[PDB]
Amino acid sequence: QQKLVEVAKGYSLVTHGDEQYISYYDADGYLVLGKRKLNSKQWTLHRTQYRGHNIISIMVDGEGYLHVSFDHHGHKLNYCRSIAPGSLELGDKMPMTGVDEGNVTYPEFYPLTDGDLLFVYRSGSSGRGNLVMNRYSLKDHKWARVQDVLIDGEDKRNAYWQLYVDEKGTIHLSWVWRETWQVETNHDLCYARSFDNGVTWYKSDGEQYKLPITASNAEYACRIPQNSELINQTSMSADAGGNPYIATYWRSSDSEVPQYRIVWNDGKTWHNRQVTDRKTPFTLKMIPVARPRIVVEDGEIFYIFRDEERGSRVSMAHTADVANGKWIVTDLTDFSVDAWEPSHDTELWKKQRKLNLFVQHTCPQMIYVLEANTN
Phi-psi group of 329: left, alpha or beta (phi > 0 → left; psi -120 to 50 → alpha; rest → beta): beta
Contact indicator for 289, 305 with CB cutoff of 8 Å? yes
325, amino acid identity = G
Can you give the chain as a three-state secondary structure string? CCEEEEEEEECCEEEECCEEEEEEECCCCEEEEEEEECCCCCCEEEEEEEECCCEEEEEECCCCCEEEEEECCCCCCCEEEECCCCCCCECCCCCCCCCCCCCEEEEEEEECHHHCEEEEEEECCCCCCEEEEEEEECCCCEEEEEECCCECCCCCCEEEEEEEECCCCCEEEEEEEECCCCHHHEEEEEEEEECCCCCCCECCCCCECCCCECCCCCEEEECCCCCCCCCCCCEEEECCCCCEEEEEEECCCCCCCCEEEEEEECCCCEEEEECCCCCCCCCCCCCCECCCEEEEECCEEEEEECEHHHCCCCEEEEECCCCCCCCEEEECCCCCCECCCCCECHHHHHHHCCEEEEEECECCEEEEEEEECCC
Is 41 annotated as belonging to a binding site? no
Is 115 annotated as belonging to a binding site? yes
Contact residues for 345 (Cβ-Cβ < 8 A; gap 6+)? 13, 14, 15, 20, 354, 355, 356, 357, 358, 369
Angstrom distances, CA of residue 236 to CA of 103, 132, 135, 148: 26, 19, 20, 22
Contact indicator for 328, 318 with CB cutoff of 8 Å? yes
Is 188 annotated as belonging to a binding site? no
Contact indicator for 120, 133 with CB cutoff of 8 Å? yes
Resolution in Å equals: 1.5
> By CB neighbour count within 10 A (0-12 exposed, 13-18 middle, 19+ buried), where does 242 fall?
middle
Is 242 annotated as belonging to a binding site? no
261, amino acid identity = R
d(CA 93, CA 77): 9
Boundaries of every domain in the chain:
1-375
Is 219 annotated as belonging to a binding site? no
d(CA 342, CA 314): 8
259, amino acid identity = Q
Question: Which residue from 133, 113, 124, 107 is spatially nearest to 12, judged by alpha carbons?
Answer: 107
Method used to determine the 3D structure: X-ray
Contact indicator for 116, 135 with CB cutoff of 8 Å? yes
d(CA 184, CA 182): 5
